[PDB]
Each structure stands twice: as structure tokens, then as C-alpha cells.
Design a protein around this ligand. Structure first.
Ligand code: FMN
Ligand code: SF4
Ligand code: SF4
Ligand code: SF4
Ligand code: FES
Ligand code: FES
Ligand code: K
Lengths: 87, 214, 264, 42, 430
């Protein structure tokens, strides 16, 4: 339920092939640019970094939770369907 | 003590024969009519108690029957039956002796009552006699604390008990007659022993001390 | 300020709607009150008592998940009373929590472990023996190890309100209260992996995912479910180039916080 | 106006169905119950 | 007045406490019940609430909250919902029998009080939630209710005052937690007896989501006598802010364990050797007293010498006046065993909904078991004190507070006893 990991913007790369090592079965890769992510304070700062380094970027807008109408008295409603059958 | 989970047994499978008698159905209808419309699901406890009073204990088939009668979830019925302590989820004897061993009953020495019941019935606490006439358990406060020590057998209160007195109560139960409940130390109720320290004078009656303008 | 009230949190003013809880005001200002039983898509239960905070000029701590702010309250979230309440509640939980962290599927995804490290104490005054609860068999999808359960009724509220099955519940009383089904009932319906999602402890784990990987091992890839046509957003967790788990994504316009069992 | 004798003995001859039968007998004296607007909360 | 006690029998309210007179409608009418009830209801709600406020009657349940204000919380226009008066006759507290006694021996005062309170708040029904073990008491209450219905005091014309009132009796199934207000509300609503959080208060959301008010049997039963004889008389009895008569249940190590009705602010000593016949062995043989039921801490003899029986007096004595259950323990009492049995009772009766009470009260039961055995070390006394302070004020209802308080009293007073027990166990072990 923690939300502290949803505060900073992140840039990652497209995933490439991770095949199987013949000797041990380890996950072997060929790209270098896979295990890295970059952290940013702002979407426009991340976009500026991407255009400065010449990488084609897909930007996704921030998904914030919609505010909810929470009330403890709805669990014991006289006529509404929000009355709970148990606690 | 008991386990709050269900295991199917040949005596407590969900196919054991339980159904309400027509007069019990009339009583259930009376309870539902007492409760409001749309909140008739509040009748879970009285209908479950009526099922217990009909059948002795409460099998899983009786729980499901109460659930389908009241159109309430069987899980809610199970929750009620497992939360509340007066619903017997296992078969008990004809006489269910509950001995109160809470602190003032302990002060008035209900331990002697418990040990003499154990010796007289030949059983430990929480178990049933082989002839299925007596079950003996310890319970919390039963609401009669100045009358300590005390037991409750079925719906009857036996108070001011000595070991000899509870021996005659057990003998009367074995003989099959009504043990005439109440205190057994010669006093009628919670009044002080050896005299009445209050309410000696007759009550004043109607229209006494009524204020003006009323 | 029409249809709005002013409330203070750590001396910082904020404007909230009437009926807004203390926890909602705190997440509005930008901090997260500790929680175990509160879920923003379930009904308010208020039993875990982790969200107790101190209001200024008030000698009684209040539960942030249930108490609504009225007017001009000062919510002292990092106060000494709030810290002591959080420490006491977490040590009460870990008194009878089983000592099962290495063999637990909720290895690094444990709210109990995390919030214990964050707010609780670091030692134990429990010199007694813990309680142990027998395990249920609600289905081959959800593996139940009910010793780890902290009785937050999240699964019960979810099954009652969203799944709409009314099959789970609390049987018993006191320390012996057990969450589950009274009889051996197979808990299979739609959206039945979200109990594995929203159970904070590792009481309700995923049987196909059982004893496979760890959250620090798994890499998260944001993708779209295609098993049905709802197009629910998912996170595919892959470790060492192999798909390990499917998790939902918070998208309020498509699937909220849940995915179907076929998807999962 | 006797005061030396216990006179609650009516509770001695009470069977296991006394409360329920008297509730059933008394049910015809009650006012109609209010309606919640639905048959059940479902 | 300065010295209290010596209540007169003509001023005593419960004139049939011992059941020596008839408890039916004829006996109630002979003793003065159901008198000018139609005049009371025609005087109406505001007059009754003013009478309660001038009485200054507090809750007999143990909460201690002013009955006048608590009943005036429902002096509102209806929002399309019914309003309910609920009576608590659970009597869970150990040491207490007063509500059982007054329901069994004088139930028409209870029915008249239900009618008076329902008219005062504005209500259509009073649900009397009785303990399930009180089968004979519930049947007697039902007999009295049927007598009132046949006499026309209840139902479609409340004593001819053009007021529709119903009285229901609902039985529990043995839960001290269902003795509580909101858990009682849920028990009436049919769910398992777990208290709900406040807000919403029962004056806004109670049983079935309707505005309700839960009131004690003693409070409801003294309501119509208060209305008939006036609030000034009830306020004149007792001290300031602790006024009126009170049913004290004296039990334990006393010569005559009894329930008596006595004026408030009576000295505890005077009460004990006036109605209980004295402590077994004497006041020198007295060791400790729990004055306000098992949710209140213990007090030793040195402070029992001159303590009064007020809410404020017991608060100043670091205790409370709950259901006026005076449990008396003499020099031969195993005091740690008594308190540990109380904590075991609280462990068995906690509903387990909320974590501090559930886990902590189980923990304190285990710790006090080891304290009775002597199997601990003196740092665990302070550890148990901190556990009790962590439970108290962090729970949903006041069962956690009522379980933490007796251990707090035992640690505060009889700490050398615990240290001596641990020392004895240590020197016998090695
Ligand atoms: C755990 C718990 C149990 C209680 N049990 C009872 C009980 O059995 N009977 C009772 O009259 N009050 C009981 N009370 C006190 C109630 O709060 C009180 O009766 C109720 O609020 C009515 O208020 P009153 O005292 O003003 O009438 C209990 C309180 C708590 C916290
Ligand atoms: S759920 Fe319990 S056992 Fe599992 S990681 Fe968390 S604290 Fe450890
Ligand atoms: S199983 Fe999990 S979700 Fe359910 S009550 Fe227990 S801890 Fe909460
Ligand atoms: S304090 Fe105890 S009895 Fe009260 S709600 Fe919490 S668990 Fe239940
Ligand atoms: S303590 Fe035993 S009846 Fe109350
Ligand atoms: S999060 Fe509020 S009590 Fe659990
Ligand atoms: K989980």
C-alpha cells in the first residue's frame, strides 16, 4: 500500500534478447543499455534529457489516484446497499 | 477449547435431518414480524436459538436451514454461531451445568463446587458423562454475583451453593425431578442474610411525592 | 471556500471537502499514514489501529482511516503520541505474527515488514509462545497460511463488496478468531486473485507463483492484458528472461486496481 | 399485603418455549413495522 | 448536606428490590408505577429532558455520561427514518447483579421508563437487549410487557396519550462485548457482536441505521420516578454532579453479600458494615476493594478508610464508579490470582476485532498467569505497565481500557507482593 516509489519520473529502455547460457543456464544478454534506469524530478526534464541524448521516447502521463468519498457511516445505512453484512 | 472449524462427520454432515416444526415456523414468523421489513436479517440470533432449543445442539444442517429460512448467507450464520457462546456446536447432555469461576465466585469458593461436581459426575470439565445426562463446563460471570457460588443448569439458576447442596441438586437431576431453583442458603434472593437492612416499611403507593403542576 | 473546510496538518493549511478523513487529508498534503486494514476501494473497517494520530488540543488519538476532519484541526502526524501508538500497535501485531519471513512468498512485498522497519520498534518484549492456526484449502489458486493472518478483514470486505460472494468471514472470538470459511468451501469466483493482491501479510499467496522468485529479483514491465476485451493495464514481472507473475495496474478508467483470474 | 413470603414462583414453571410462545401471543398487539425500501440489502 | 447515606425507604425508588411484593401489574399499581404517565407524555419531550437535566442523573452503565444530554442528543426533527430507544440489560460485568434483580422483581418500572424515554427522545420502539442466560428474567419481562399491552399502557395509545410505542425484548447469547453499546447495536442488527467506531454516534446511526439511544436498565427504571417526583428531589439527593440513588452490589469476602439501594456519596466503609454485615474478619481483615466493577482498578484499605462512592471521588482515588459492584477481598485473598482471573475473563470475552485489545489482552493474560506462578522477573512489571498503557486509549471500545485498568491498579498498589512472589520463586528454584 506504500506510494513512495511513485514520486520520481523514470526513464527505461526497450528490452532486448536475454537468451540462455549453454554452460550454466544463466540469463545472458547482448545489450548494455538494459539494467539502467534514470530518475528525474519532472516529465519535461526527462524529455529534455531524452532529446539531448537523441533517444526516441514514449512518454506516459502520471497516473494519480482519484479522490474517493469515504465514510464509515455508509457501512450501517438504513436503506442504501452500502450496508455491510459483516465486520 | 472447541475448534472454530467444521469437519464432516456421520453425525454432523450437511445431510443430517433437521427441519422446524410448524409451531416453530410460527415462532420464526413472529420474530421476523417483530423485526423491520428489509432488516428481517437481524433475526439470525433468535431463530438460531429456537433451532438450538428444538434440536438440543446446533448441527451444520440446522445452521444451513436457518440460513435458507432467513435468506441470509450461511457464512453470516456460521459467524454468529461461532462468535456466540450459548450456541452448542457439539452435542451436549440433557443437563448442561455451567459453573461460574470468575473472581467473586472464586472468592466465595466455587472451586469446591467444581471439584465436587467433578467427583460426583466422575468426569472432568468440558466433557460429557457416558450416559449423556450431564455436561459440565466452566463459564464467565452469569450475572448472580452476590449469590456466589452458583451454577446454571439449562435455563435454571442455582445459587448460594455448598458442596452438599450441589450434591442434592445432582441427585435430584439424576432422579428426574425439578431441583427447585434459586438460592439454597435459606435466603430468598439478593437480600442480606440474617435480617433486612432496607425496604422494611411498606411501599408508599400511588401519588406519593408527586410534584406540582403534574 | 464554498463547500470546503480548512484543516491543518503539521501546521500546514489545506482545503478539503466535508466528510474527508484524516488519512485523506494527509495523502492530500503528501504524506502516507500507516495502514493495514484501510483500502481506498474497500469499505472502512478501522480495526488494525495502525492509523492512530494525535490531533492538537485532543488527549485521545484518532484513527485517520475513519475519523473525518471537522474544522481547523491540527493533525500532528509525527508527534510523540502518534509514534508511540504506531510502535505499540506494530509490536502487538508482531507478538503473535509467526516467524516465517524466509519461507514467505511476501518476501519484500510485505507491508508488515516494511512498516515495522519504518515505524515499529526493533526488539521484542514477547516472552511467551505464539499462537498457531491450522491452514484452510479455499482453492488451488489462493494458498492460505492463516498463521500469518493479522485479521484485517480486507479479504472479507473484498469478497463481500466487490466479488459479491459472502463466503469468507471471521469465526470465533478473541485471540482465537480465524479468518476463512467455516466449512471446506472452494473459494472460486471472478476476481479471486485480488485477495492475494490486497492481503498485506503473506497469508493469502499465489499457488502458481509459490516459492518461485522475489520482488527484488523481478523486473517490472508495463503491458496490456488481452485475454478479454476490457484492455486492463497489467505489470508483467519477469526474472532472468522468463515471465513470473502478472499484477494489475492502477487505472481508474479501465479496471481500477484489479484483474480477472484468467488474466492473473 | 404479605411481605414475608417470596411471590415470584411464576418463574419456576417455565418451559423451554415460554419466551417464544409469549412473543407469538403478543405479536398481535404490535404496530406495523417501518419499511427499509427493499426486501433485503442483498 | 455534608454526611451522606441513611437513605429513607419512602425516598428509595426500587421499592421491590428483594421481590417480597408482587412484581406483576397489580403489584406495580399498588406500589405506584404507571401513575400520571399520560400526563407525563402530554407534558412532552422538552419537559422530560429538562427534568433529566435538572436531575443531573448520570449513566448507571459505568460510562458516567449525563443522561439528560445523552437523551437530548435525539431532540431533532426526523429525517424520514424511525428513532429507537434501546435498553441494555446484558449485565456482563462481574460483581454486578442489580439490573437482573430489578428486571426480575420490578419490571413494570422498566416498561414505564422505556415509554417515558421513548416519548422524551421521540421514538416508536424500545428494544430491550437482555442477556441470553437470563431466561427466567426475560420471560418475566415478557409477562409484564404483555400485561402492559393488554392494559393499554403500550401500543397504539400510550396510556391514552395518542402516542404509538412498542416494546420488544431481544435475547443475546452470552457476550460481555455484546454488553457494550455499539456491539449491542450490531447484535440487535444480527451480526456478530463487534463494536463500531464513533463517529457515527448512535444518536445519528444506531440499530438498522436509525437514530437510537442505548440506556441502562437502572437509568431507564429511575426515569419515570424522576419525572413524577421532580428533578429537584433527585438532585437534592447525592452530592454535586453525583446525585440520586444507586444500586450497590456488595460481594466477595463479606458476611452478607447483597444488593442494596443506597444514596450516592455514601462512604464505602459505612456501606460495607451497614449493608454487607462487615468484612469477614473485620475492617482490619479487609485487604482490597474493587468498587466499580471489574473494569475499575483495585484500592487498598488505607485509601478505603474514607473514600466515597462518587464518580468524581473514585476518579480522585484513581478508580471509577462503574456499575457499583463492590468486590471485597480480605487478608487471605490471593490478590494476584484474583486480578489474573479477571484478565483471563477479559481474554475470554474480548471480541478480537481490534489488534491492541486482542493481542495485548491475550499477552497480559499469559503474563499474569506467570505472575501468579511467580515465574517472572521484576522488569516484567514495568513491561506489563507499558503494555497496559499501550492498550489503553488505542482500542475501539472501552473493553481494552477496562482490561488494562485492573493490572494498572495492581501494579500501582500491590507491587511488593509481586516482587516477593518472584523472589520466592527464584529462591526456591535454585
Ligand atoms: C465492554 C463494555 C461492556 C459493557 N457492558 C455493559 C452491560 O452489560 N450493561 C450495561 O448496562 N452497560 C454496559 N456497558 C456500558 C455501556 O456503555 C452503557 O450501558 C451504555 O452506553 C448506556 O449508557 P448509560 O450508562 O448512560 O445508560 C459496557 C461498556 C463496555 C465498554
Ligand atoms: S507476512 Fe509475516 S512472515 Fe511473511 S514476510 Fe511479512 S512479517 Fe514475515
Ligand atoms: S487473510 Fe490477509 S486480507 Fe484477510 S484478514 Fe487476514 S491479513 Fe487481512
Ligand atoms: S477493545 Fe477488544 S472488545 Fe472492544 S472492539 Fe477491540 S477487540 Fe473488541
Ligand atoms: S462473577 Fe460469578 S455470577 Fe458474576
Ligand atoms: S488503517 Fe485505520 S485502523 Fe486500520
Ligand atoms: K498476500
Amino acid at each position: 500500500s506504500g506510494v513512495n516509489n511513485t514520486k520520481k519520473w523514470k526513464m527505461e529502455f526497450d528490452t532486448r534478447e536475454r537468451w540462455e547460457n549453454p554452460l550454466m543456464g544463466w540469463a545472458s544478454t547482448a545489450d548494455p543499455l538494459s539494467n539502467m534506469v534514470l530518475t528525474f524530478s519532472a516529465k519535461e526534464d526527462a524529455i529534455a534529457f531524452a532529446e539531448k541524448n537523441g533517444w526516441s521516447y514514449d512518454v506516459e502521463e502520471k497516473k494519480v489516484p482519484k479522490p474517493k468519498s469515504k465514510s464509515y457511516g455508509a457501512n450501517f445505512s438504513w436503506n442504501k446497499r452500502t450496508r455491510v453484512s459483516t465486520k | 477449547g472447541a475448534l472454530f472449524v467444521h469437519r464432516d462427520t456421520p453425525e454432523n454432515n450437511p445431510d443430517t435431518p433437521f427441519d422446524f416444526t410448524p409451531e416453530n415456523y410460527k415462532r420464526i414468523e413472529a420474530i421476523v414480524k417483530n423485526y423491520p421489513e428489509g432488516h428481517q436479517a437481524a433475526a439470525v440470533l433468535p431463530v438460531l436459538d429456537l433451532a438450538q432449543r428444538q434440536n438440543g445442539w446446533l448441527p451444520i444442517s440446522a445452521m444451513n436451514k436457518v440460513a435458507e429460512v432467513l435468506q441470509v448467507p450461511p457464512m453470516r450464520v456460521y459467524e454468529v454461531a461461532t462468535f456466540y457462546t450459548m450456541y452448542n456446536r457439539k452435542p451436549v447432555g440433557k443437563y448442561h451445568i455451567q459453573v461460574c469461576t470468575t473472581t467473586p465466585c472464586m472468592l466465595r469458593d466455587s472451586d469446591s463446587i467444581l471439584e465436587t461436581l467433578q467427583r460426583k459426575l466422575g468426569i472432568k470439565v468440558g466433557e460429557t458423562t457416558p450416559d449423556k445426562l450431564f455436561t459440565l463446563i466452566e463459564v464467565e460471570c452469569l450475572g448472580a454475583c452476590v449469590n456466589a457460588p452458583m451454577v446454571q443448569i439449562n435455563d435454571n439458576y442455582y445459587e448460594d451453593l455448598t458442596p452438599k447442596d450441589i450434591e442434592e441438586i445432582i441427585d435430584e437431576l439424576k432422579a428426574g425431578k425439578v431441583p427447585k431453583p434459586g438460592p439454597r442458603s435459606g435466603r430468598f434472593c439478593c437480600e442480606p442474610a440474617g435480617g433486612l437492612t432496607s425496604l422494611t416499611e411498606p411501599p408508599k403507593g400511588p401519588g406519593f411525592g408527586v410534584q406540582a403542576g403534574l | 471556500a464554498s463547500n470546503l473546510i480548512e484543516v491543518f496538518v503539521d501546521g500546514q493549511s489545506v482545503m478539503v471537502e466535508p466528510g474527508t478523513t484524516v488519512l485523506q487529508a494527509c495523502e492530500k498534503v503528501g504524506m502516507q499514514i500507516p495502514r493495514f486494514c484501510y483500502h481506498e476501494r474497500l469499505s472502512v473497517a478501522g480495526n488494525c489501529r495502525m492509523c492512530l494520530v494525535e490531533i492538537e488540543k485532543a488527549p485521545k488519538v484518532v484513527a485517520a482511516c475513519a475519523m473525518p476532519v471537522m474544522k481547523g484541526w491540527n493533525i500532528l502526524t509525527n508527534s510523540e503520541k502518534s509514534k508511540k501508538a504506531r510502535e505499540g500497535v506494530m509490536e502487538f501485531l508482531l507478538a503473535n505474527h509467526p516467524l516465517d519471513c524466509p519461507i514467505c512468498d511476501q518476501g519484500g512485498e510485505c507491508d508488515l515488514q516494511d512498516q515495522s522497519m519504518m515505524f515499529g520498534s526493533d526488539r521484542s518484549r514477547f516472552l511467551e509462545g505464539k499462537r498457531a492456526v491450522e491452514d484452510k484449502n479455499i482453492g488451488p489458486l489462493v494458498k492460505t497460511i492463516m498463521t500469518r493472518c493479522i485479521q484485517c478483514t480486507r479479504c472479507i470486505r473484498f469478497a463481500s463488496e466487490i466479488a459479491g460472494v459472502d463466503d469468507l468471514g471471521t469465526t470465533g472470538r478473541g485471540n482465537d478468531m480465524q479468518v476463512g470459511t467455516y466449512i471446506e468451501k472452494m473459494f472460486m469466483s471472478e476476481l479471486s486473485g485480488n485477495v492475494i493482491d490486497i492481503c498485506p501479510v503473506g497469508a493469502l499467496t499465489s499457488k502458481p507463483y509459490a516459492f518461485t522468485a522475489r520482488p527484488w529479483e523481478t523486473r517490472k514491465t508495463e503491458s496490456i492484458d488481452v485475454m478479454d476485451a476490457v484492455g486492463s493495464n497489467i505489470v508483467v514481472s519477469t526474472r532472468t528472461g522468463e515471465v513470473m507473475r502478472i499484477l494489475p495496474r492502477m487505472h481508474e478508467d479501465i479496471n481500477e486496481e484489479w484483474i480477472s483470474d484468467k488474466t492473473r | 399485603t404479605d411481605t414475608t413470603t417470596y411471590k415470584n414462583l411464576q418463574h419456576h414453571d417455565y418451559n423451554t418455549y415460554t419466551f417464544l410462545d409469549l412473543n407469538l401471543d403478543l405479536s398481535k398487539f404490535r404496530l406495523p413495522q417501518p419499511s427499509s425500501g427493499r426486501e433485503s440489502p442483498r | 448536606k455534608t454526611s451522606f447515606g441513611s437513605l429513607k425507604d419512602e425516598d428509595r425508588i426500587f421499592t421491590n428490590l428483594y421481590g417480597r411484593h408482587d412484581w406483576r401489574l397489580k403489584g406495580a399499581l399498588r406500589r405506584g408505577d404507571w401513575y400520571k404517565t399520560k400526563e407525563i407524555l402530554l407534558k412532552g419531550p422538552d419537559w422530560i429532558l429538562g427534568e433529566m437535566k435538572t436531575s443531573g442523573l448520570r449513566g448507571r452503565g459505568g460510562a458516567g455520561f449525563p443522561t439528560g444530554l445523552k437523551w437530548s442528543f435525539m431532540n431533532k426533527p426526523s429525517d424520514g427514518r424511525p428513532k429507537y430507544l434501546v435498553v441494555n440489560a446484558d449485565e456482563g460485568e462481574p460483581g454486578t447483579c442489580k439490573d437482573r434483580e430489578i428486571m426480575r422483581h420490578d419490571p413494570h418500572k422498566l416498561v414505564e421508563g422505556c415509554l417515558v424515554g421513548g416519548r422524551a427522545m421521540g421514538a416508536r420502539a424500545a428494544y430491550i437487549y437482555i442477556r441470553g442466560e437470563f431466561y427466567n428474567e426475560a420471560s418475566n419481562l415478557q409477562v409484564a410487557i404483555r400485561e402492559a399491552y393488554e392494559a393499554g399502557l403500550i401500543g397504539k395509545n400510550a396510556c391514552g396519550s395518542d402516542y404509538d410505542f412498542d416494546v420488544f425484548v431481544v435475547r443475546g447469547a452470552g457476550a460481555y462485548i455484546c454488553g457494550e453499546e455499539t456491539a449491542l447495536i450490531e447484535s440487535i442488527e444480527g451480526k456478530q457482536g463487534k463494536p463500531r467506531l464513533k463517529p457515527p454516534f448512535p444518536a445519528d446511526v444506531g440499530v438498522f441505521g436509525c437514530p437510537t439511544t442505548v440506556a441502562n436498565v437502572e437509568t431507564v427504571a429511575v426515569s419515570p420516578t424522576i419525572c413524577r417526583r421532580g428533578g429537584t428531589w433527585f438532585a437534592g439527593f447525592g452530592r454535586e454532579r453525583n446525585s440520586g440513588t444507586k444500586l450497590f452490589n456488595i460481594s466477595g469476602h463479606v458476611n452478607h453479600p447483597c444488593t442494596v439501594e443506597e444514596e450516592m456519596s455514601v462512604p464505602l466503609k459505612e456501606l460495607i458494615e451497614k449493608h454487607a454485615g462487615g468484612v469477614t474478619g473485620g475492617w482490619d481483615n479487609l485487604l482490597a476493594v474493587i468498587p466499580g466493577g471489574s473494569s475499575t482498578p483495585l484500592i487498598p484499605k488505607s485509601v478505603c478508610e474514607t473514600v466515597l462512592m462518587d464518580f468524581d471521588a473514585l476518579v480522585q482515588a484513581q478508580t471509577g464508579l462503574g456499575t457499583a459492584a463492590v468486590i471485597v477481598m480480605d487478608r487471605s485473598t490471593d490478590i494476584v490470582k484474583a486480578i489474573a482471573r479477571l484478565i483471563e475473563f477479559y481474554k475470554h470475552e474480548s471480541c478480537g476485532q481490534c489488534t491492541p485489545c486482542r493481542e495485548g489482552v491475550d499477552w497480559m493474560n499469559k503474563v499474569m498467569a506467570r505472575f501468579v506462578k511467580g515465574d517472572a522477573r521484576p522488569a516484567e512489571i514495568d513491561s506489563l505497565w507499558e503494555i497496559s498503557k499501550q492498550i489503553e486509549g488505542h482500542t475501539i471500545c472501552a473493553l481494552g481500557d477496562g482490561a488494562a485498568w485492573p493490572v494498572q491498579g495492581l501494579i500501582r498498589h500491590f507491587r511488593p507482593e509481586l516482587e516477593d512472589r518472584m523472589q520466592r520463586f527464584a529462591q526456591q528454584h535454585r
